[PDB]
Amino acid sequence: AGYDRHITIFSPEGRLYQVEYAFKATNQTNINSLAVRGKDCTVVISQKKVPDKLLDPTTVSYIFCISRTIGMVVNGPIPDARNAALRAKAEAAEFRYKYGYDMPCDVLAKRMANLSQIYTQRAYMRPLGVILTFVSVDEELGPSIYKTDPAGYYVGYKATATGPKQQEITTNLENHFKKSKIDHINEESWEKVVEFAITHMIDALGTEFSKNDLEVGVATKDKFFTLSAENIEERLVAIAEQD
Amino acid sequence: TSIMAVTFKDGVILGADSRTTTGAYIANRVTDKLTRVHDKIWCCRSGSAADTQAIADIVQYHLELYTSQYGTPSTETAASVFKELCYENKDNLTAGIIVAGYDDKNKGEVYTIPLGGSVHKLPYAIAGSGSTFIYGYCDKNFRENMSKEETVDFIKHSLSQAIKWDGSSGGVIRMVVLTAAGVERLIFYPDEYEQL
Amino acid sequence: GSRRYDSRTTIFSPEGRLYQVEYALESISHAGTAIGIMASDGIVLAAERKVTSTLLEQDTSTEKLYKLNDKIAVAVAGLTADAEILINTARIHAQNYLKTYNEDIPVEILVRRLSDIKQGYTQHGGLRPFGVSFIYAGYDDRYGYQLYTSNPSGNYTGWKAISVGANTSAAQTLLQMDYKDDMKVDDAIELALKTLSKTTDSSALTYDRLEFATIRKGANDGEVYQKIFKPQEIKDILVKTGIT
Amino acid sequence: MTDRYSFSLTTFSPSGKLGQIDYALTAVKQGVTSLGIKATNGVVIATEKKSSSPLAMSETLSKVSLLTPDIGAVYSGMGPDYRVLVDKSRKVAHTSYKRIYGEYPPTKLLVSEVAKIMQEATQSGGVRPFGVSLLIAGHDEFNGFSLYQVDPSGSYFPWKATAIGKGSVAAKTFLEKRWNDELELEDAIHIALLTLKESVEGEFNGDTIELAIIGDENPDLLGYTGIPTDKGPRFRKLTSQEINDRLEAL
Amino acid sequence: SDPSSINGGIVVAMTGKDCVAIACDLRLGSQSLGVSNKFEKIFHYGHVFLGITGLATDVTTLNEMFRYKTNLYKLKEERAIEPETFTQLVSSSLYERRFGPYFVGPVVAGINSKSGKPFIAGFDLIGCIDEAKDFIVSGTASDQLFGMCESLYEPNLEPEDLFETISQALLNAADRDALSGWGAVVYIIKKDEVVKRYLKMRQD
Amino acid sequence: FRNNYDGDTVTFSPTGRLFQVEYALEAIKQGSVTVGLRSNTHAVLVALKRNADELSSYQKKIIKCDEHMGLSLAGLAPDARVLSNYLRQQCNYSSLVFNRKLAVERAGHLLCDKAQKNTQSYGGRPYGVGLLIIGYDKSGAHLLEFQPSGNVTELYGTAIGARSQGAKTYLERTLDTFIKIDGNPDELIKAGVEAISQSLRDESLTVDNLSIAIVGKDTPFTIYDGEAVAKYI
Amino acid sequence: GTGYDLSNSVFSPDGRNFQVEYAVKAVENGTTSIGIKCNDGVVFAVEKLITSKLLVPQKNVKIQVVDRHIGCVYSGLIPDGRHLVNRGREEAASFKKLYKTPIPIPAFADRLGQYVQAHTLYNSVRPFGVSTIFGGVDKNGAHLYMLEPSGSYWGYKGAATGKGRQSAKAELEKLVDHHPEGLSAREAVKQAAKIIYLAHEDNKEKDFELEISWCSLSETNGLHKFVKGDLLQEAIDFAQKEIN
Amino acid sequence: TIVGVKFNNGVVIAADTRSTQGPIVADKNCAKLHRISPKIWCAGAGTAADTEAVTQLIGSNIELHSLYTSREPRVVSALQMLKQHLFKYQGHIGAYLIVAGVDPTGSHLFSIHAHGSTDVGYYLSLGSGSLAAMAVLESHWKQDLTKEEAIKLASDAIQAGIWNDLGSGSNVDVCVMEIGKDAEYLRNYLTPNVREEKQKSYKFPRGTTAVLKESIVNICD
Ligand SMILES: *C(=O)[C@H]1NC[C@@](C)(O)[C@](O)([C@H](CC2CCCCC2)NC(=O)[C@H](Cc2ccc(OC)cc2)NC(=O)[C@H](CCO)NC(=O)CN2CCOCC2)O[C@@H]1C
Ligand SMILES: [Cl-]
Ligand SMILES: [Cl-]
Ligand SMILES: [Cl-]
Ligand SMILES: [Mg+2]
Ligand SMILES: [Mg+2]
Ligand SMILES: [Mg+2]
Ligand SMILES: [Mg+2]
Hints:
Chain A: InterPro entries: Ntn_hydrolases_N, Proteasome_alpha, Proteasome_alpha-type, Proteasome_asu_N, Proteasome_sua/b, Proteasome_subunit_alpha6. Chain C is an alpha+beta fold.
């Protein structure tokens, strides 16, 4: 009777507690991430926290290069994050081989979401305690943000935020898009779209960032790439000469 | 078919004719036999078109999945994947493939994989039915660390002779230049290479 | 391990009963009543639709009376979804027999096979039984007009008249009271409706809450005919018998 | 490793209840309201696009899905469960019918195939039932227009009109008043929009409402000309504009 | 050696004015030896007629298979299968055995019960559909039947006329083939009724 | 506490313990005592055989695995038979494929890895027996102690089973003496008999009670039982 | 309620996996082992508790080699560590067979990572009762990694796990601060010896044996080798001098 | 005889309408132009059953893929799926296809051989009439053709096959696929092989055929 909270079977209220507890694991890292769409680019910002002095800062990342075009930022424990990353990479490679064109952001998102849904219905598979935010400049839809969760839910976003202080970043971005009356950042260069994403990250969280406190990924036409510490510093110097 | 890859000072150049024949009929006179498996790793296909395409498609898949995980694969790594498919399926494959790629550390490299599925790293490699006629010419005229202009000439002269004698070879001479500068596509029409 | 969450659906109680079979029969006891009555010149199948609405399309609806063969039909009591799984396999077994022997399957052989599948879920596999009881109405050239019943235990028996689903105890008493061996189909149609009318948990027995089927050997032919009654045809026979 | 859950997770309780099916139906009741109305010359299926954030793009989430060019589906309950059922439903229409008979299945048979998939999740080892109820509206040459409900149990019933989810009890009552056997498709869309307005709390417009019809053949949507027998799909999803036009005559 | 030439036999189908006709010979032999003079090669599943030529064991096997499949179709669909639909079932059924095929030449004939449109079709042993408006031929005397049909046939023949045409097409083709003949049966199919006639032909 | 986390081997306790493994280790302590000790030239097994009745036989404790390797058991005899049979095959495989006598150290590594697989998978149970493997390979005399946990340790001497601590303390004291008994098998066996007799209490080791095995430089693994051990009592 | 810690793959209400956290206790219970990343390589060292004089000195080796360029040392259940290296060796062989080049350290790290993480997905398996410190030299420099029972791993300048991990980590932290230009392979071996001797004070009751291995581009040609004879004694003496 | 010709704003495929068993013409008007997706059309040569089966299978899988991804089918997808299937069967599925169509990425023209080799060109031809057609294409093809020029060239190429090849005959089927608009399928675009009126009517006087036995057949159940 009381085992309806151990495996992915329905509770009397029609709820899956293992799915709800999997959602709780996504905040274990205490990391906040947001994604915004430019005129012809997509930018993901994530907090980078290195507590141990013995850690190699270069190896600590929750942003993954899935394919040439698709990037993925994860909110959750790194073992589950890397499980989801390797699977997405494998699915992106296999898709290209079988269908003869690069897997679109939203199709990989749907596929990963369908996998998560199976763990939600089969008892022997647990859900992964992660939220996957996929970004690209799709060759049909243009700048694209698609996010999946342990429930197997997925949807496209104009912009999005994930983590403990998700709601603060969300409402901040909401209020900007109510004001601008558009569904993207009206800017030609990606550098200024990254500067926007960092600016509204600071405003919402109320925290100042050094070059080692942030982790940036940019998607453009036919490439997704992550910024180095020095690329971020150049970005932090630009926002400083405005405030 | 006449195919070759030549290492030079700045990198490597792949060259091929454009003729596909089913018997004595030229099924395609503008075939692209120079196939991309990675940004700066290309291969020359010879033998069964079906087999070499099936292999190249699988290799491109393997290197795309390699890149996703471990970053840019070496030209040697690409040749190893080609080898593994060719050797382990030697009974059901008629494929002779030259693998050529530009690495920033290793510069230009050429690997040749004949029918058996063996691997041979060479300064330059020639293959296909038309190659038999230019073993003499290529051995006498090849020098190491040639210029881009010199290497293009060596391949243009070599393949023109192969085309002239081999009925299974002909059409245009396609080349693909692999250097630090990037990837350059070259084409040379009969009205040029025939009168060398 | 997984042992923690195993219900063990195929075990005996200390009394020597099969828990899941007993609880499945309890499930069926709440399903809409279905009656079969065998006469000298045919068989009748009558069933009560459990839960209806003004907006339920009755014309395109079938939840109790299914056609297995050109000579065999079933009345369902329990999970409709479970019944459709067994009905589909029964339809196939009938066609396998016809393909093999070039003869229509004798009624008992079909019934035994379905009953043997139910018995399987009772002894091995660790799956829940099918929450279904069937009334088989059929004809073959060996035993003529036959009426069978099967339940989740995988046990089957033959009847002159029988009920399954809700209020079988009451329904079986009324049938045992008014049934005679020399009965005609038209007498059996009336008996079937009278019995349902008195065992119904609803206000009145209207046409929109009934499914009706007869298996008769129309004298002006010499062959067996299955008739699954249309809504208008149920409405008619309901007025003639004196229930309006 | 290996699925060692080879036993049923849905079992009969001493009362004769199947717990996991009852609990699945409870999950369906919590879901957003969706309805279906059958007219003389078409069928309409409608639901509310409950956007989980105003930053989210409600267009990139289709609650109403094409199964075949003449069959459409809408649900109430768990979205992910619906999404994989649509994927399986589209595939089974091909594998189990079109690849055999060279034509799309009739509504009742595709419904029957979806029903089977959901029944198997009720009996098969190491799985829970699907936490959705489907409304499948379709047309076929020999049955005309039809509307079916499919429940987690695997049970399905044909409807003239019905609703499922949150305010199904109130919505079913309102449909019983307004429905007749002489309704035109435009009258059914009007009744559908009226019924759904009682369910929606916030904004009620073309951007918050998802509505599709099974009506006449759309030769403009076929994508090719020259085959007279091919006249186009009967399934059409109404645009954001097309809904707002009918909302001014509410 | 050739399984299509062991038993022998022929089938021919023709369309007329609001009618179709399908005919076949009655011979079942083993090479030169004639065994049966009563082996019919035309079967019907509702209002859809199927004629099968080729290896006799496969003729009987496919008849039993299509009765099986049409019986299940009728129970699920709650209606008789139509000629166009049945044609697709035969095609997909034969191609299922692509690399181990039934050595047969099937012929579908019937009138679509809804549209009232006459329909015939022919197949190769692996199930390639040959949909002709005029006529279909199959069997050991297919060359002969093609010659007779191509000459005798004219469009929009009345049932009584179409009978004479298909009968003469079959009879004269059969008398030029060693492995065909030994009696014949013709089916005249209309919307409402179907007439079956046994032809008097040469018994050599 | 313990009652909830000892149902199977696939479950860790809150303190980080595997109780099913520890329960298997308990089956060894209940088993009859056996002693192992080696010099630089020879390795000796001395095992006390246990009887059910005075009418029963004394169950054999030493199994030969190859001409250069063998082991003594303490716990479930069938589990000793399974593991010894596996080790026989690995010794056999090494000979046929590589024409190579299997190194005693590598025999230990294989037993360790086989025991481990029974401690991480559901449905399986740990092996309920401890083994003392002796062997003379290319790197001289060897003695191993195997535990169902998967832990294998190379030692100069040791003992396992009931009252095994008596023999283990003696060997820990006699270490410097017996290590140097090189080219004298009889003195190494006598030193092993004096070791096992330190774990007696019930009876005195008799003729059909004592079981001794030896391997070394120019001695193939041979088992001495009955009359043959009379000159050591 | 409770019972969230009885099954492996089960999430607790606070989104934790208790079976993984219980495996960490088995690791914390185990011997102390370290890894030091020097300017052109990595050094591995481990404490070997001498149970009795009966243990043959220098024989019961704990540090394991993968391929010819990777060193692996672990703390906790030694058999579980051996099982992980067995997999790692199969994994490295698979990579080399297809791609020719010996497996990069990051590539190898994720390979162990995905395998350990897989033993937290199902209730039919137990999580690994070891934290593994591993690394070596590849195409582009030296790499040091530490892998937790959860499947979690990162790159490290220095790493420590087991009984005296705090003593170790504290001593490692001092080296990172006082050598920003980077420690040498020779120095890292001496330094590793000291940290093991200092971290042994959390288990000072039992006498212990020191075991060091290293993989340096200049000192071992980028191959994993064990520290033996003179260089081992020189390192033991450096530690024995600075313990007083 | 099947051909494909690229023009500046799309692609056209054409085919004859002769089906043969050995030297006998089985169908005088069979359609060799098949629809994979609404804007991807296929012309088939070789084993008749194989070309039809492989086109229907990939067509079915392409539809399911199109619904799954919520995108228009791509020609490179139909190409990759056909080549990988044909290759797996080592040429035992004797299908030789010219696959053409328009998709979001533009207009495409490919040929697929039975062993799973693919070619890309501006003009292609396959079948027994391949060489008769290719001779016309190699003579008249230029770069930047109009829609009307491409139909003319493609049609002329099939006519070369019909007249000069015994394997090919009867009528010309054409399908035009323009980047902007719906694909238009022109069944019997040309009918240059109409049968001349017969010299005599072979209508028999009723009662000509001798009948032994007559009976009405039972269709109704
Ligand atoms: C232009 O080049 C045309 N030339 C004519 C022709 C016949 O070569 C063909 O390729 C045509 C392709 C069309 C036919 C109409 C349906 C769509 C495909 N091919 C055939 O008609 C084909 C010829 C053929 C026969 C047999 C073999 O292998 C032995 C290869 C080619 N005919 C058939 O396949 C007939 C069916 C006709 O109803 N089948 C057989 O004879 C049965 N054998 C098939 C192989 O396996 C053994 C049984 O049209 C091109 C475009
Ligand atoms: Cl999927
Ligand atoms: Cl090619
Ligand atoms: Cl060649
Ligand atoms: Mg689960
Ligand atoms: Mg030439
Ligand atoms: Mg004759
Ligand atoms: Mg004769």
